[PDB]
């Protein structure tokens, strides 16, 4: 369902007409889905060489339309309570340090590099704080 929008070529810079099977998760992310690594594995593990053609990937997406589409339905309200845990004065803000803590120390533990990449364009105020509702909105924008 989610269109390629010429993204496949960025994953295949070596003119193979195919991309690494291990790149499938990131490809799915690039076109608009938000799969867990587990979902990616279930999709592949279900004729699938070390690579996949665009047509093979499109076939996989059509078969898994509902499950992939289900990864794009998150709402801001799903995450506010989690941030409120780190909101000392109930100001709607969290320190950049606490955000890193949340993301690298809890849940699936993102890497410090992933958090660096995430925060590259995130506004941090003069108190080292981030408006988390605005942050969530940015992360969830399609």
């Amino acid at each position: 369902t989610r269109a390629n929008k010429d993204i496949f070529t960025l994953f295949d810079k070596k003119g193979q007409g195919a991309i690494a099977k291990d790149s499938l998760g990131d490809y799915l992310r690039a076109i608009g889905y938000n799969p867990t690594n587990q979902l990616v594995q279930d999709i592949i593990n279900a004729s699938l060489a070390s690579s996949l053609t665009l047509d093979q990937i499109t076939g996989l997406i059509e078969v898994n339309e509902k499950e992939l589409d289900a990864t794009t339905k998150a709402k801001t309200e799903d995450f506010v309570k989690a941030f409120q845990v780190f909101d000392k004065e109930s100001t709607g803000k969290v320190s950049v340090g606490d955000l890193r803590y949340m993301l690298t120390g809890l849940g699936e533990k993102l890497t410090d590099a992933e958090v660096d990449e995430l925060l590259k364009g995130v506004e941090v105020d003069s108190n080292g704080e981030i408006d988390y509702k605005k942050f969530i909105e940015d992360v969830l924008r399609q």
């Binding site: 993204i7 960025l10 990131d26 992310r29 690039a30 608009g32 889905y33 938000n34 799969p35 867990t36 990864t71 998150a74 799903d78 995450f79 309570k81 989690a82 845990v85 949340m102 993301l103 809890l106 849940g107 699936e108 993102l110 992933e114 990449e117 995430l118 590259k120 364009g121 969530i136 940015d138 992360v139 969830l140």
Partner: peptide, 25 residues
Amino acid sequence: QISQAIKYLQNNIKGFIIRQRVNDE
């Protein structure tokens, strides 16, 4: 609970990171 909420957010963050990267590329 927070663990579940954070995991769900992390999946979306991974999505966001890749989409920003593709834009930058």
